[PDB]
Design a protein around this ligand. Structure first.
Ligand code: HEM
Ligand code: XRD
Length: 447
């Protein structure tokens, strides 16, 4: 209760904390659900405690633009106070202040639209693997469990592009890359370690000194073992430019991009199933641009307007990262409130994405929201990839992979519900947004 008066004192509303734990019990229902309930309850700003760590949640866009862009470098440079990660404290999402400022700089040339335009054929090759895989499953007439197919694609594309070559994960379950990377799936709140770290950060130096890491030590090595072993994609581009630092980044990319890409694709496809009119219209768009199942190309995949709007609206409904988190590296005035050092600020993307103030019929899937014809979207309400210098660096790359996959599958099949399709979709209560029950759809071919 050392800090459990901070918000009472500073005139900031919030749910009453419980000793030691904080409001953390409220997280078991899921953060997206907690973040919104508070939003509705407390308005523009509410405070909570993670054990002892205060947490300030801002919804006003200007305040957001302050935290995310204006004073990203003067104050809010780090995300969540670092945990027992050992040497992956070099990977870019985890580094802080200057160490990150460098690593960011030294990886930017890899994620420019130019290098992406370059990598395009190495990615689109993975769509042929994907189509066979989805035909196999649907040739039968058998409902398809999307997370198998598109989890597989997600990993194949990232593994191969990040380091190595095609694994065809679905048909090589015993591949040593497949079993080892599959272990990022259980990240966040689930592990006892994260809880003890969340509630008692002062143990973090301890676990480091005991070589106990949040990450699966069993796999971190095998990846590093395969990285140094190799020393067309991220690898060589990293090659041209420490050797531990290089080995981290390769792993974080797989981390930051494996499960997000996967959940978003099956989310997109779920919505196309339950709005067949949107599914035709995108099919029409695809067939006019690449007639007779033509091979995709970079400048096409980028200029497909509806397709962009379709991915974009899905990220409105399903911001897989739920919230954006920054740490005050110094005392700071955030919108007339005095916020001590170490504190965390939360920009509640999911809740802001579902606000009726900014989105007519917020629960409805309406790709038209993103018509370039309409008034541009506020980049601090819509924060699916972050904004500011700390945003998803692979943003352009992820949108490419998903669009590539979505095109290939939509050239060859449609998607519709069946008896086993959960409608409405329900979210799970842990980690990145995922469905309560896995998505299964009927996938008939167009011929
Ligand atoms: C649908 C796919 C993805 C989504 C929704 C997503 C979302 C996000 C978000 C919200 C952040 C943090 C933003 C912030 O702090 O405000 C982030 C960070 C990051 N993402 Fe992604 N991401 C995706 C895919 C990827 C992929 C494929 C990669 C790399 C190949 C990637 C690499 C990274 C990295 C390195 C960071 C941390 C960089 C930093 O802290 O400066 N992301 N991502
Ligand atoms: C998990 C793969 C990944 O790299 O995700 C992150 C990212 O930037 C790219 Cl998505 C990663 C560094 C840490 C991730 C957050 C930790 C706390 C956390 C616990 C949850 O239960 C739900 C969401 C977050 C709040 C989080 F998961 C997401 O925002 C995504 C973050 C920031």
């Amino acid at each position: 209760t050392r800090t459990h008066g901070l918000f009472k004192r500073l005139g900031i509303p919030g749910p009453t904390p419980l000793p030691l734990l904080g409001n953390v019990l409220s997280y078991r229902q899921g953060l997206w659900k907690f973040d919104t309930e508070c939003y509705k309850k407390y308005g523009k700003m509410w405070g909570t405690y993670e054990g002892q760590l205060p947490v300030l949640a801002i919804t006003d866009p200007d305040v957001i633009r302050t935290v995310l862009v204006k004073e990203c470098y003067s104050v809010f440079t780090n995300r969540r106070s670092l945990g027992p990660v050992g040497f992956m404290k070099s990977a870019i999402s985890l580094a802080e202040d200057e160490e990150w400022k460098r690593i960011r700089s030294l990886l930017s040339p890899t994620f420019t639209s130019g290098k992406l335009k370059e990598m395009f054929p190495i990615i689109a090759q993975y769509g042929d693997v994907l189509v066979r895989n989805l035909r196999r499953e649907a040739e039968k007439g058998k409902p398809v469990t999307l997370k198998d197919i598109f989890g597989a694609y997600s990993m194949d594309v990232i593994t191969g592009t990040s380091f190595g070559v095609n694994i065809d994960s679905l048909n090589n379950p015993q591949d040593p890359f497949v079993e080892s990377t599959k272990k990022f799936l259980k990240f966040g709140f689930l592990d006892p370690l994260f809880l003890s770290i969340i509630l008692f950060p002062f143990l973090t130096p301890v676990f480091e000194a005991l070589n106990v890491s949040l990450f699966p030590k069993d796999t971190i090595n095998f990846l590093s073992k395969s990285v140094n072993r190799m020393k067309l994609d991220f690898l060589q581009l990293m090659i041209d430019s420490s050797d531990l630092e290089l080995a981290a980044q390769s792993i974080i990319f797989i981390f930051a991009g494996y499960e997000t890409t996967s959940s978003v694709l099956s989310f997109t496809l779920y919505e196309l199933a339950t709005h067949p009119d949107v599914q035709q219209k995108l099919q029409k768009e695809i067939d006019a641009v690449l007639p007779n199942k033509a091979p995709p190309t970079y400048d096409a995949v980028v200029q497909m307007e509806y397709l962009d709007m379709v991915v974009n609206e899905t990220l409105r409904l399903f911001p897989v990262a739920i919230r954006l988190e920054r740490t005050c590296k110094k005392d700071v005035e955030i919108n007339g409130v005095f916020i001590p050092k170490g504190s965390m600020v939360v920009i509640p993307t999911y809740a802001l994405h579902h606000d009726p103030k900014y989105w007519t019929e917020p629960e409805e899937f309406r790709p038209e929201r993103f018509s370039k014809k309409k008034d541009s979207i506020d980049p601090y309400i819509y924060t699916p990839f972050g904004t500011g210098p700390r945003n998803c660096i692979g943003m352009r790359f992820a949108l490419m992979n998903m669009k590539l996959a979505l095109i290939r599958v939509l050239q060859n099949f449609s998607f519709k519900p069946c008896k086993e399709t959960q409608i409405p979709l329900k979210l799970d209560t842990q980690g990145l947004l995922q469905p309560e029950k896995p998505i299964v759809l009927k996938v008939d071919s167009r011929d």
